[PDB]
From a paper:
Dynein is activated for long-distance processive movement along microtubules through interactions with its general cofactor, dynactin, and one of many so-called “activating adaptors”. The activating adaptors (hereafter referred to as adaptors) fulfill multiple roles; they mediate key interactions that stabilize the dynein–dynactin complex, recruit cargoes, and regulate dynein’s activity and processive motility. Here, we structurally and biochemically characterize the interactions of LIC1 with two adaptors, BICD2 and CRACR2a. Crystallographic analysis shows that the LIC1–adaptor interaction has a conserved hydrophobic character, with the amphipathic LIC1 helix displaying a nearly identical conformation and its hydrophobic face embedded in a hydrophobic cleft in the three adaptor subfamilies.
A crystal structure of CRACR2a47–122 (MBP removed) in complex with LIC1433–458 was obtained at 2.66 Å resolution. The monoclinic crystals, belonging to space group P21, contain eight complexes in the asymmetric unit. The two EF-hands of CRACR2a display a canonical fold, consisting of incoming helix (helices α1 and α3), loop and exiting helix (helices α2 and α4). As indicated by the ITC titration, the structure reveals a single Ca2+-binding site. Consistent with the sequence analysis, the Ca2+ density is observed within the second EF-hand domain of all the complexes of the asymmetric unit, whereas none of the complexes displays Ca2+ density within the first EF-hand. In CRACR2a, Ca2+ is ligated by the side chains of D97, D99, N101, E108, the main-chain carbonyl oxygen of Y103 and a water molecule that is in turn coordinated by T105. Like in other members of the EF-hand family, the target-binding site consists of a hydrophobic cleft formed between the incoming and exiting helices of the two EF-hand domains. The hydrophobic face of the LIC1 helix binds in this cleft, and the same conformation is observed in all eight complexes of the asymmetric unit. Like in the complexes with the HOOK domain18 and BICD2, highly conserved, hydrophobic residues of the LIC1 helix (L444, F447, F448, and L451) insert into the hydrophobic cleft formed by the EF-hand pair of CRACR2a. We have shown here that CRACR2a is regulated by Ca2+ binding to a single site within the EF-hand pair, which in turn triggers the binding of the LIC1 helix.
Author numbering:
A (entry chain E): 47 to 119
B (entry chain F): 441 to 453
Write the structure that this text describes.
């Protein structure tokens, strides 16, 4: 089951990091408000939930790890 | 944890 997860984490990591940086910043999570139906307020909550180490920087492994906790409940 | 579900569930549509 883990391969299907990773295929989605890549898809969704790419979607947030549309600029090709190699990580998701606190401002990629804001421009999602225009594409997804959530308040900016929720988006930063998401962000905050996902940055385990508090860099203010979302890495693929941090992104993939979060999605995997979710994918499996 | 629910706001992650929201955010992921939304990404899935
Ligand atoms: Ca980080």
């Amino acid at each position: 089951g883990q391969l299907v997860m990773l295929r989605k984490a890549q898809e969704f990591f790419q979607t947030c990091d549309a600029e090709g940086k190699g990580f998701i910043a606190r401002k990629d999570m804001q421009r999602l408000h225009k594409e997804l139906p959530l308040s900016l307020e929720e988006l930063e909550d998401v962000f905050d939930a996902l940055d385990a180490d508090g860099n203010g920087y979302l890495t693929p492994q941090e992104f993939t790890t979060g999605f995997s906790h979710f994918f499996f409940s | 944890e629910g706001v992650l579900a929201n955010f992921f569930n939304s990404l899935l549509s």
